[PDB]
Subunit: 127 residues, 4 copies
């Protein structure tokens, strides 16, 4: 299914939903980046959301170390495919991953042509 840099103990997952049709956003391209010491965004993982609008196996726990990560969702292409003119070029989610805090990260995005919401669910279990 939807997987990126090695399907592992999904410590990071992306969920995308379409608020116009009331369905998950399928085949949306998602690019994850990590902030390098040179302070640039270097590629990390990427993929297309699945039938259920999810993206799993982006990374691994061993490779998912503390740092600033940027999740970029290609919303514009998504709306253009539907023949709908959007407002944003894409949607970004910038956050610092820490070790002390809970483990698994679920980033959710709800999309409309002129608006988008984003939530983080941080828990201890698999989700």
């Amino acid at each position: 299914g939807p997987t990126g840099t090695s399907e592992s103990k999904c410590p990071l997952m992306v969920k995308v939903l379409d608020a116009v049709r009331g369905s998950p956003a399928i085949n949306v391209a998602v690019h994850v980046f990590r902030k390098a010491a040179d302070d640039t965004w270097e590629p990390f993982a990427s993929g297309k959301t699945s039938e259920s609008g999810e993206l799993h196996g982006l990374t691994t726990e061993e490779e998912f170390v503390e740092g600033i990560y940027k999740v970029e969702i290609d919303t514009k292409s998504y709306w253009k495919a539907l023949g709908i003119s959007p407002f944003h070029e894409h949607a970004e989610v910038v956050f610092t991953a820490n070790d002390s805090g809970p483990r698994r990260y679920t980033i959710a995005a709800l999309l409309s042509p002129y608006s988008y919401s984003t939530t983080a669910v941080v828990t201890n279990p698999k989700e």
Copy 2:
């Protein structure tokens, strides 16, 4: 300002936005009810949003007593008028008003066919 009927100091205001068109939601019918002593909803005020997606002059400070109120937004008619089949029948906002002194309420609503967000901004008046 006004007394016993319209926007005394507009203690109650409603603002609605369209997340599909990136515009204010115009001509949206709004009905306000107050919880009646006999535990039933009594019609309190009604109106439609203007060109700016706003609704003012619903009530007055003297008429806006303590109580539980219900702001009902006819979202369904709105999308239907636009050629879209929405999911909700309407959006309802229920809250206790003025129970520790009068305040000014702005009920904001962001609409999408299958989704809606509502937020309240509360102010302690000053003059």
Copy 3:
């Protein structure tokens, strides 16, 4: 786990998340009602969200017929437990369930003390 009127082929499910803590809202009371011909809301199913903030087995496909349903989420108690003063008395979701349209219904709610968003995901599979 979290189940209401007979755990069946979950044609209706409730998902509730807390936007202040970045976690699912656990132990939230949810009451579903159906509009009766007398046009009153008669009880249908109810329960408390689980560890993951979900509520399943509310109803059955045979008993989940077309009609107007109201999902009521006790948000106020939820915030009061956390020692946080909320704005709404509760959150309601009013919608018409139809047969032609897709099958399974997932109602999602994202909560903040002064704001709440709600989405419907309507699909053909189990979710």
Copy 4:
């Protein structure tokens, strides 16, 4: 009105709300960038939100040419100032502006520690 610098007809405006307190988010730092010909972000304008959670006078109609712009909202500093540890580093809003004639843009933002919604309201000016 103004030319070459501030709110000519306020072609660009930003409004931020706090979903935890039910109030405007005051003193939130905002940085605007424009995509530079060499594919990099060039500082375009900056400011802080007022008592009303608003930011006006960022640019002028003559200076607000066609281009891709990035509105960055320092949400992190905001919650930290409030004693809360947020999830996002900030909230970024990227869009193409004025590519088919000048328009007026109102970028709205609703904030919660672990969640944020952003909406745009676009107007074709008239005088």
